[PDB]
Amino acid sequence: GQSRERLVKWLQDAYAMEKEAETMMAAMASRIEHYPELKRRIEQHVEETQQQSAGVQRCLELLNGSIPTAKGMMTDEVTKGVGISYAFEHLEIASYRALVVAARSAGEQEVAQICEDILQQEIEMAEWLIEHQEAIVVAFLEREQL
Amino acid sequence: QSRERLVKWLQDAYAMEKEAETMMAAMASRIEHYPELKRRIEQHVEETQQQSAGVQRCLELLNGSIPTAMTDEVTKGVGISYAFEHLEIASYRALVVAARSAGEQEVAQICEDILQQEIEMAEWLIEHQEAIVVAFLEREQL
Numbered sequence: 673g674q675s676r677e678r679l680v681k682w683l684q685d686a687y688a689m690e691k692e693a694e695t696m697m698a699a700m701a702s703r704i705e706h707y708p709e710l711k712r713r714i715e716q717h718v719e720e721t722q723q724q725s726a727g728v729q730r731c732l733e734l735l736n737g738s739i740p741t742a743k744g745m746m747t748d749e750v751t752k753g754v755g756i757s758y759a760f761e762h763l764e765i766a767s768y769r770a771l772v773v774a775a776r777s778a779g780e781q782e783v784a785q786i787c788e789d790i791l792q793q794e795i796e797m798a799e800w801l802i803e804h805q806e807a808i809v810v811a812f813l814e815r816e817q818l
Numbered sequence: 819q820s821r822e823r824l825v826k827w828l829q830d831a832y833a834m835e836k837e838a839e840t841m842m843a844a845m846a847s848r849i850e851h852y853p854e855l856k857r858r859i860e861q862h863v864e865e866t867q868q869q870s871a872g873v874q875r876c877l878e879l880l881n882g883s884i885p886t887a888m889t890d891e892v893t894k895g896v897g898i899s900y901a902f903e904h905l906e907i908a909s910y911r912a913l914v915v916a917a918r919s920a921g922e923q924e925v926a927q928i929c930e931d932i933l934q935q936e937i938e939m940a941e942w943l944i945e946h947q948e949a950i951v952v953a954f955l956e957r958e959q960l
């Protein structure tokens with residue numbers, strides 16, 4: 673009842689969140705000239721994301737909830753991209769944690785697993801950025817004032 | 819140029835803190851059912867006012883300018899709170915690097931102290947997150 677349709681409600685948010693993530697990454701990847709590791713990483717996550725929402729959509733198809741309708745719409749952009757990248761990966765964490773709860777409460781244990789697995793990838797990814805972060809910042813600085 | 823990148827990222831963060839302050843000074847008023855939460859956010863609405871003023875003392879020191887210009891609310895806002903505090907972290911960590919590179923050790927200490935508050939605050943949210951979600955759910959399908 674309200675359990676399914678709250679789960680469906682948050683499933684739809686995420687599906688759309690994953691599409692925004694996929695475009696935000698598929699576009700941060702385009703700007704990288706100086707961090708093959710960084711760039712290499714984001715590319716791998718653009719593919720992982722595509723598989724997330726497709727997983728989310730299987731969950732929306734299962735519970736009869738519909739599948740959200742697409743919306744359109746000395747440079748610093750790389751240091752600050754790693755910063756927004758990290759914050760969105762935490763937006764995602766929080767959301768998926770709270771999905772595992774809306775799934776458990778709804779007794780949809782299969783949905784809950786999907787969500788815990790997507791969650792671990794966001795954690796994995798977020799971890800990748802905040803560790804490699806410091807080097808990216810420094811190299812930026814040393815390069816800028818060369 | 820070391821100074822002017824430090825000033826540049828100091829400028830961003832001041833505007834960030836001022837957005838943070840106005841976003842929390844709003845979030846804390848939507849709360850009706852989470853006493854600890856409301857009471858925690860309030861406390862940081864002011865930790866925050868003490869942050870940017872600190873940032874400003876840094877902007878004034880380095881001769882840089884000071885920048886210019888049922889339904890979901892609760893759990894979702896908790897999620898955005900946690901994401902922003904994490905935006906902040908990253909930004910203050912990068913400041914600690916730019917301060918250091920620029921040989922402004924005292925600016926760095928400030929940035930490291932604000933970094934500790936954002937970690938402590940994001941820590942408070944994600945620990946208490948699971949309860950807010952659970953109580954929200956339970957409540958809405960009584």
Ligand code: NA
Pocket residue numbers: 690693720721724764
């Ligand atoms: Na993702």
Ligand code: NA
Pocket residue numbers: 835838866869906936
């Ligand atoms: Na803050």
